[PDB]
Amino acid sequence: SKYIIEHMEEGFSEWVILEYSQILREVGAENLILSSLPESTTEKDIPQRLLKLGLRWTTKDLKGINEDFKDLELLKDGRVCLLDPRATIDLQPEDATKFDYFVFGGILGDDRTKELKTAYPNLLISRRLGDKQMTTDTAIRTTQLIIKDRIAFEDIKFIDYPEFRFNKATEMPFRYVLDKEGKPILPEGMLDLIK
Ligand SMILES: CSC[C@H]1O[C@@H](n2cnc3c(N)ncnc32)[C@H](O)[C@@H]1O
């Protein structure tokens, strides 16, 4: 149903902007919240590319989104799923029946998801998306494929640590989802930034 990203960076680097943009395009602005922005954040501090796409953002943390958005169902104990790389159980399609909200770490990893968990010990229930680390947009892409499209994790086709060779080179230490044409799905604009 609804996707929440907890922003755990200060600002918005080009990478973050591209990821969040892709997320906005795939889940729809009405189904995404960016929460836990720094206390002094105002509209001026939010990238115009994300505002343009209808980004719903808040400086409130998980325990406050309901105060801010009457549209959202009460974040209720046990019905919010934390996508957690160190969880003992992988998300499966029937979990769609068991959670209304899916929470992701707004991070650019070099763990931090455990800080998210520890922060809200009674709210969140963890589910994993496999044994290898994904970018936020890949994690959200996979979650949607499981919850909305009901594909088992094990039927999804990934690439582990793809190399992008522009001439006779960068390898991304993340797991990526494959498109029908067998290419890794990247946020629009990401490849140029990599080059
Ligand atoms: C820093 S990665 C961005 C976020 O995507 C989610 N995520 C990334 N990789 C995985 C994984 N293997 N399993 C579950 N969730 C993940 C986590 O919520 C993480 O904070």
In testing the pocket of ligand 1, which one of 80, 113, 175 has its CB within 8 Å of the most ligand atoms? 113
Question: Is residue 190 a part of any domain in this protein?
Answer: no
Q: Is the CB of 83 under 6 A from ligand 1?
A: yes
Question: Is residue 108 a part of any domain in this protein?
Answer: yes
Q: Is the CB of 143 under 6 A from ligand 1?
A: no
Instruction: Report how far Cα 51 is from the mean position of its chain's Cα atoms.
Output: 17
Q: Which residue is it, tokens 């589910």?
A: 127
CA distance 105 to 19: 12
CA distance 92 to 71: 27
Tokens of 185: 């799905």
Q: Is the CB of 128 under 6 A from ligand 1?
A: yes
Question: Is residue 74 a part of any domain in this protein?
Answer: yes
DSSP helix/strand/coil, 1: coil
Q: Which residue is it, tokens 């039927």?
A: 155
Q: Is the CB of 142 under 6 A from ligand 1?
A: no
Total domains, the chain: 1
Resolution reading in Å = 2.7
Question: Is residue 178 a part of any domain in this protein?
Answer: no
Q: Identify the CA nearest to 172 among candidates 160, 161, 187.
A: 161
Question: Is residue 48 a part of any domain in this protein?
Answer: yes
CA dist 62 to 129, 179, 193, Å?
A: 21, 33, 32
- Say which CATH number the domain at 29 has: 3.40.1280
DSSP helix/strand/coil, 175: strand
Segments forming the whole domain that contains residue 22: 2-154
Tokens of 118: 């520890």
Question: Is residue 57 a part of any domain in this protein?
Answer: yes
- For residue 118, give the H/E element and its range: helix 112-119
Question: Is residue 165 a part of any domain in this protein?
Answer: no
CA distance 36 to 24: 17
Contact 86, 112 (CB under 8 A): no
CA distance 110 to 59: 25
Q: Which residues pair with 195 in a beta bridge?
A: none
